[PDB]
Amino acid sequence: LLKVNQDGSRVLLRDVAKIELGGENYDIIAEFNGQPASGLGIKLATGANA
């Protein structure tokens, strides 16, 4: 509930904005042979054995 109006109407968040389970960030998008994929990129620690 964001603000209650005079006229009994409630102003919900649902109304004021669209709401979705979504990406924390939409910069990086990954595709494996065109098929959509998400990935893990491992960089080696300083000195440890590969």
Interacting residues toward other proteins by CB under 8 A = 25-27
Cα(11)–Cα(18) distance, integer angstroms: 13
Q: How far is the CB of 28 from other proteins (least distance, A)?
A: 9
- The smaller minimum CB distance to other proteins, of residues 25 and 46, is found at 25
Contacts of 10 (CB under 8 A, 6+ apart): 1, 4
Q: How far is the CB of 38 from other proteins (least distance, A)?
A: 15
Pick 7 or 20: Cβ nearer other proteins = 20
Sequence-distant (6+) residues with CB within 8 A of 44 are 50
